[PDB]
């Protein structure tokens, strides 16, 4: 990957993304 605490605190901020679209849709379109 890049950077070993970044990649995990990365997937971890994106699990918080699809998590925040989860009101119209947490499976497609949980990405800008």
Known sequence: CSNLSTCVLGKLSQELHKLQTYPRTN??????
């Open 27 to 32: 499976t497609g379109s949980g990405t800008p």
